[PDB]
Amino acid sequence: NKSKAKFTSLAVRSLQDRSSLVRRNSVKLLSKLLLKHPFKAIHGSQLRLSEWEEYLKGSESQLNSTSVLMKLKLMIVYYKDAISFIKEIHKSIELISNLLFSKNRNEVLESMDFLVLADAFDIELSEFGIKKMLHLV
DNA sequence: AAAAAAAAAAAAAAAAAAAAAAAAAAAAAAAAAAAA
């Protein structure tokens, strides 16, 4: 699970690569990572930045107010990892939305598939991606 | 006191060649058809 964040960061960085095939494969990797993630034990299949931030704030308040110490520590580090992953996915979504207008059709199709998958899970910036996709006519 | 002969502007066509636009070669990914 730890290497998942590294793979996501490398894929987001490679999204800006000059080669088109590399970009399509990075989009595929991000789609595969978003389709199944370890972040499903609690409130699975729902990636909302506001809700996760509120949950993290609640956990921080609970810790501020024997097993309790490290249990809250693990919960907080898990929530921080979730927030970082959500931010990375949001940045990747923005990059792919900017990347929608490409000469190669396979890249466009994979970008549309990734945006649809990201829209399937409730995402605040998914509507922007759908709006950008609407101009593909 | 016309008439050859040399010098000089004016003007055709001809030869030239490397630089750039356009097309082919090579490796790899994707889509369709055939065999198990």
Instruction: Tell if A37 CB is < 7 Å from nucleic strand B.
Output: no
Instruction: Decide: CB of A21 under 7 A of nucleic strand B.
Output: yes
Q: Which of residues 112-131 of A touch strand B (CB under 7 A)?
A: none
Helices A67-99, A20-35: inter-axial angle, 10-degree rounding: 140
Cα distance between residue A89 and residue A29, in whole Å: 12
Resolution in A: 3.0
Can you list the pairs that A35-38 forms with residues at least 24 positions away whose Cβ atoms lie under 8 Å? A35/A117, A37/A4, A37/A85, A38/A1, A38/A4
Strand B atom within 7 Å of A24 CB: yes
Cβ of A23 near strand B (under 7 Å)? The reply is no
